[PDB]
Symmetry: D2
Subunit: 422 residues, 4 copies
């Protein structure tokens, strides 16, 4: 029964053609949904009750579009998101952190516009986790956003939005200095011929997967759901194809901001992403990712590829990793394991930010530190196992891979352990 | 010999990649498509696309197959549409090197347990009006195809039957349906209601894969450019959907309401044309050819043996085209199954085979109207020269190019066995 | 070039030109052949073990000491000829030469003792002489038995039963010497600890031109099973009378290593020849060169693809450790083992990194020579009060011995494989450590 | 039938990995194809008897080597005369005549820097006696090959020059030597002294790989069956060495002392024949063909384009043979570089080309002696029938088999452009 679920017959295929032939509509997805859902917050989804339903449906990141709306409006939206998120903080084994992202208005006619400087300052003051920098054309644009965040905004992730021809041409220099990329298809589809956008999407997803950096596919994914309760055949196909391409996050804009079915749009993306993740051809994908990743003498990098390889060998349910900054979880995520990466952290910001990485399920550990560090590490691993059993990831008898370091502080990951559940 | 500029067009840097990941990374928005569009466009004929002037613009935009939906309209309405399509198509027959054959397909209303009474009448209509293809609605098992084949009566055994998979039973019995059908249509509209909407992409990918494996045409249909019914430009998801159906391996892409009732029927056809050209260049031929080769079984049929030899030779020299002489279309279909980058120019005297080969990706049919020569070898050579003259006129060929020429050793269908390398002079 | 640029900056261009590293980066096997360089020097220690047959030419304690220094790992006693008294004297001489180096771990090289049976000859089952010879082996504490003319699985069960209750730890290597053995190979392999491709008898039981097919099929199936495979007979035959081998002989040795043989053997070359030490040195030299010419990119992928899924943590940790060793060009994988099993599971994935096996079992230290790439270290210190400290002392012993023997350098990365509790069968931890 | 797919290692050929391929190798899977690696036998006291030479030709000798390291010009002229007499004794039955090449192995430069005076005399002797191949000893750089070419003068323009790599400089300057040579000989005897004995296998594997990549013949020589000089059976290392040279990709394998001066010259030739047949079936064509196509660059030469198409078509139908018409041997050489499993039967009128194509693996030369037909197309068809008749007589072909035929569109060398699929009647 196990080998007939989650497209396991199609996963055993020796060719991609044989893999397509073996895809089964009756082979049910078992794994948790890995691709994160970014929902834009607007009038259709601003109430605390609305937001609680959206978190339950699968929203991981809340986007604030600073193109329209006042600072007062956006501060109220942030307060509402935080209130809906913290309403679930009473049960720590099931708490789902939700990141807050600020989408800048952009340079328009102008370098960094004065409104952008004010909006970036607002973001730092309100503790946003991510910034979607609009119309990034070169590496110096990213540096300008980083300087506008100042010394207080060091921890904020900068995701560069590629929306025009120059951004696509200077992609490699932009990616080198950004934390991730957003394929902003709306403006891109106007700046370049509409029929070429899929080429830019596929090239950018490929290069981000190669770099190990998050990539977001955005705009008009379920557009018809703004007025209709069901998406078109092209829309469900578009979402599935962005996941198959290798997108870390999928986004909803007007569908959640102004539409009549914001919760239904989130549920629809959740349903499609789960099916698409099972249809991934891991045999070729893992080989190509493994081959392309450079040789490294960084123990975190070395332990990560050992852990992903071991997870494939035993069909591990999860890889539990201890992380301070999210880096150890991100290095596991780049090799695209089929096993869920349960990241246990004390940093609330790192817990929200790891939603950018496909397959990372953040767990915020709130307990106070133990006297003996080894015991504190062991307690955090047990917390990961308990939350895993509670959320359905783990069952007794399952194998898990545990990734830890030899000393406290970030950057010392070097241990991988094979563990039997209970 | 070819120059540095040549190797920067039609995604040639991405084609040289050693991995699919490297291939994705090398895709360039500035690498212009050079090859002609190989995925055929099926347009549904309706109120928005009925006039002879409108049909002439649609043929110029890229329509290869005209669909008549027998769920709507009447026998009289649909007979007038057929007459209008034929009139617009024949308006270009005066320039024989640039004439474009256009197939006519009848989409049945559907089933009741057996073949409905209306379907029997609509199939009789189809045979009487000389349709080339039938899209059989709601095919659930092989016996459904046999019923359609029997209803095509005495005079219509040459009509192609494309089975529409629109429900769970069709998907489950797919292999038996494909065995007895000429091709498949992934009818996403009904399928998306009969099975969960989020599973349709799995059925589409499985079905395209199995059709590519079988060497039979596969059509992706419904809501491809849906928003273009009222808006002059499609959504980002729509252009992506069309590109992905071509990348998946679809032989044909379809327009329904976009051409039947929409405000932009010509623009919808142009949009599908533009996307398909870009998507065809993005195909990773290195892996695709090897996998098609590896999966295909051994053959002792000289037509199949010559076909794989010709495709292999076309890849070796970056041949502009493979010119094939075909009576029934079979030799062109066997070349098409290996997915060459080179255009398959099929020269035929059969007007029905010329229309029907639009079902096969990369087959450009040419209807030869000249009278036969006394010596067969001369007649064969004249038809090959006609393929070269048409290829030069339409832009496929230039002097100095290499083409592969596929012929047989004797007249009549079924004797293809020769492959020749020719330099265009 | 991008997948090695940073490591090229760190380790230098000289590092990437040694041990056929340009040929290892090749995308095709054809490109790999084209890139093989006679100026690319082997760096890693020799991983294919050398089995030398003991005889009049290699019996003296002084001769045996020179052979151990030249690279002999396993000493074979051919029971086809010679009395029990003769073979007991050879065992005594081998043990005396081996123990002459037991002062320190950087000199000590544990050498296994293997008994090659006479065989069934005319008879159907286990001959009376074989029963007597097998009981002699148990009484003298041999580590391996090369069972001659194994024709079916029941033959290996007869050898196991003849070893009795005390010989339960002895490894049984079945010799395939005829057509029936080749046909029933799968059933024989399933019940044996390993296989020997006994080409001498095989070459007259089947057509001489077919022996290479049997050798390649058998090595392939043993590599697939993760069981040791020995290539034997006439490898350096001309060296019995000549100081240098023929061009076909050096090629044969290299090809057996490239095929995937865990051990290569010398028979008449060491037992009766005029150059026993030179024959051992020649096999050593060829095996190092051949090991570097292996195309690990394809071999590792195929070994993974073919290996079934496992829920045994020892197996899961083993593949994780080998994968991590390839990622950082690790000098070694240090593994703690009681029976040798953890070292064997690392060895089946054919790492380029040396597997340094730290063990307290002298028998396991001798027996791991059957596995390609396993370098046994016998730990002689008495146990610590705290097990975690005892484990850490054994790991440090491995590092110190690796540094002192040339296996490791400061700045190198090593992969350390251990278990969560004492006793055999609990391996589950992989650690990435930087040598300081 | 089932029986067919159990012979010539066909189960091991279907394997998806090289490891699975090794596991599937069967000692009971009998070779069916003819032996494709040529056997070079050195002539001497053991093999000068015209009766002994006839037995060696029957055993499988394709090329006869004269070692100019020793022996007078009188001695070597007698050896040539005896080889020609034994070869021409079979000319009376043209469907079974086996051409045998004569190769001159030079003494070398020794202490000197350039072409020695003795080498000039021996090269002039070779041209005067009509040798087909020269094995130039101790080639250290491209200029050494040019010196041998100049010493052959204008009359020796047709002689093939195979450079022997016997030292470190030759291995280091390999690419420049290969560029100007017709082929390479891995001269392991001297090479094993000039470089450490344990490194010779690396030089052999690198050189065979680069020659296979270039499409140029490579010979593996020295001590292959050394023990057979005095013993009737080889050692286990010897049979393994021969098999491994064929598996590596060697076009020719050589016997030196074993045939020139030993006690079992015919048995040594038979032994090489037996091993080469088994080893050729054990080649993993699935990987080899893919790597050879991937490594070969795009070509606009119709001979090269037709060659890869023909090899691909031969694999598709399990063709018994590829019959090719050749004047210089070039068309057969281009087929041979892709390493087909099908025998390349080369039909030629040039006696020199017939002898020289023995350097290419899988090429079986047929010397066509009949006078030309009035119509060229008929003359071409008679030559194709001659290949079929020789093939049937020699065991390569049976009625019902498929054969690929490679020809050109006009007489003269360099016009190969046609590939045809033919059913044997
Ligand atoms: O999921 S993967 O393993 C993954 C691996 C390989 C490929 C093949 C890419 N081709 C293609 C692209 C499509 O979009 C599509 O639907 C169908 C086909 C196709 C169909 C065939 O029937 C066929 O035989 C070959 C192709 S194709 O090679 O042209 C796709 C995906 C992964 C995905 C993304 C990566 O970055 C990666 O490294 C690997
Ligand atoms: O060590 S022997 O068994 C022994 C020693 C040498 C040889 C030489 C001939 N070969 C061969 C031929 C056979 O028909 C056969 O049956 C076995 C073998 C064989 C076996 C081997 O184990 C081996 O090392 C070499 C060969 S071989 O292929 O060369 C045979 C046999 C012994 C040694 C001393 C003797 O008095 C005696 O009669 C036999
Ligand atoms: O092929 S035979 O004619 C045949 C068999 C045995 C011999 C013995 C000669 N040698 C020898 C003698 C020994 O006392 C010994 O301990 C080892 C070796 C030996 C071992 C080797 O591994 C090796 O390769 C060569 C030799 S050796 O040549 O030096 C001669 C000839 C036949 C075949 C089968 C037999 O079983 C048999 O007894 C004789
Ligand atoms: O055939 S010979 O060239 C000639 C014949 C035999 C030997 C010894 C056997 N070996 C060998 C065999 C050959 O067939 C060959 O070509 C080269 C080599 C070779 C060359 C070396 O220079 C070397 O040092 C060692 C070897 S080898 O030991 O591997 C040397 C030489 C000739 C034979 C007889 C003569 O009278 C004569 O002048 C030359
Ligand atoms: O070292 S390997 O990675 C490894 C070893 C060999 C192969 C062979 C692929 N072939 C091939 C392809 C080429 O382009 C070429 O130029 C030569 C040959 C070749 C050479 C030979 O010497 C030969 O014996 C056979 C062939 S082949 O035709 O089969 C692949 C891979 C390993 C060795 C053993 C294994 O079990 C395994 O999985 C992999
Ligand atoms: O000068 S030597 O090193 C010295 C040693 C050997 C040799 C060649 C002797 N052979 C031989 C003799 C021939 O005329 C001939 O046409 C071919 C071959 C030959 C070829 C081969 O291909 C092969 O592999 C072996 C031989 S062979 O050994 O039978 C020359 C010279 C020396 C060695 C030992 C002595 O005791 C001595 O007096 C001289
Ligand atoms: O992924 P990061 O940010 O490098 O953090 C991983 C770190 O987490 C740990 O496992 C636990 O460290 P702390 O106890 O200080 O949180 C370290 O050993 C390791 O270095
Ligand atoms: O593709 P099909 O229908 O089998 O037809 C291919 C046939 O066309 C030809 O090339 C030309 O034949 P005709 O001259 O009769 O049209 C035949 O030699 C070959 O058999
Ligand atoms: O390879 P084996 O025989 O399973 O032994 C590995 C064992 O060695 C250890 O690392 C150390 O155990 P000991 O204290 O018994 O020596 C165990 O944790 C592990 O189970
Ligand atoms: O292999 P080569 O030397 O190029 O010769 C091939 C030539 O042989 C032919 O098939 C027959 O030519 P001839 O009749 O002149 O011998 C030519 O058409 C072709 O050009
Ligand atoms: O800003 C965006 O997200 C866009 O344009 O798609
Ligand atoms: O009938 C159709 O085309 C459908 O259902 O998609
Ligand atoms: O006993 C052996 O090793 C043989 O016969 O090969
Ligand atoms: O000349 C040769 O052939 C040699 O020296 O090996
Ligand atoms: K319909
Ligand atoms: K010579």
């Amino acid at each position: 029964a196990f080998f007939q679920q989650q497209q396991l017959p199609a996963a055993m295929a020796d060719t991609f053609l044989e893999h397509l032939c073996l895809l089964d509509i009756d082979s049910e997805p078992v794994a948790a949904r890995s691709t994160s859902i970014i929902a834009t917050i607007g009038p259709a989804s601003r109430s605390v009750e609305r937001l609680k339903e959206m978190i339950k449906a699968g929203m991981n990141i809340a986007r604030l579009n600073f193109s329209h709306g006042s600072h007062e409006y956006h501060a109220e939206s942030i307060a509402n998101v935080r209130e809906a998120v913290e309403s679930f903080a009473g049960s720590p084994l099931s708490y789902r952190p939700v990141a807050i992202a600020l989408d800048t208005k952009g340079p328009g006619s102008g370098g960094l516009s004065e409104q952008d400087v004010r909006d970036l300052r607002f973001g730092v003051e309100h503790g946003v986790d991510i910034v979607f920098a609009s119309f990034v054309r070169k590496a110096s644009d990213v540096a300008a956003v980083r300087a506008a965040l100042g010394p207080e905004g060091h921890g904020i992730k900068i995701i560069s939005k590629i929306e025009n021809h120059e951004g696509v041409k200077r992609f490699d220099e932009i990616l080198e200095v950004s934390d991730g990329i957003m394929v902003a298809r709306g403006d891109l589809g106007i700046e370049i011929p509409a029929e070429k956008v899929f080429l830019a999407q596929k090239m950018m997803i490929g290069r981000c997967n190669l770099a190990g950096k998050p990539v977001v596919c955005a705009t008009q994914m379920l557009e018809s759901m703004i007025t209709k309760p069901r998406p078109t055949r092209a829309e469900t196909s578009d979402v599935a194809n962005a996941v198959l391409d290798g997108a870390d996050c999928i986004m909803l804009s007007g569908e959640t901001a102004k539409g009549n079915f914001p919760v239904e749009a989130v549920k629809m993306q959740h349903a499609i992403a789960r099916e698409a993740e099972a249809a991934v051809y891991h045999r070729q994908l893992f080989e190509e990712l493994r081959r392309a990743a450079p040789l490294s003498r960084d123990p975190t990098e070395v332990t990560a590829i050992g852990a992903v390889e071991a997870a494939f060998k035993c069909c591990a349910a999860a890889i539990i990793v201890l992380t301070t900054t999210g880096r150890s979880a991100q290095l596991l995520s780049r090799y695209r394991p089929r096993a869920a990466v349960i990241a246990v952290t004390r940093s609330a910001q790192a817990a929200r930010q790891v939603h950018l990485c496909r397959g990372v399920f953040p767990l915020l550990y709130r307990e106070p530190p133990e006297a003996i560090w080894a015991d504190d590490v062991d307690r955090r691993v047990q917390f990961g196992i308990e939350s895993g059993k509670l959320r359905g990831f783990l069952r007794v008898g399952d194998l898990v891979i545990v990734v830890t370091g030899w000393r406290p502080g970030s950057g010392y990951t070097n241990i991988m352990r094979v563990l039997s559940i209970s």
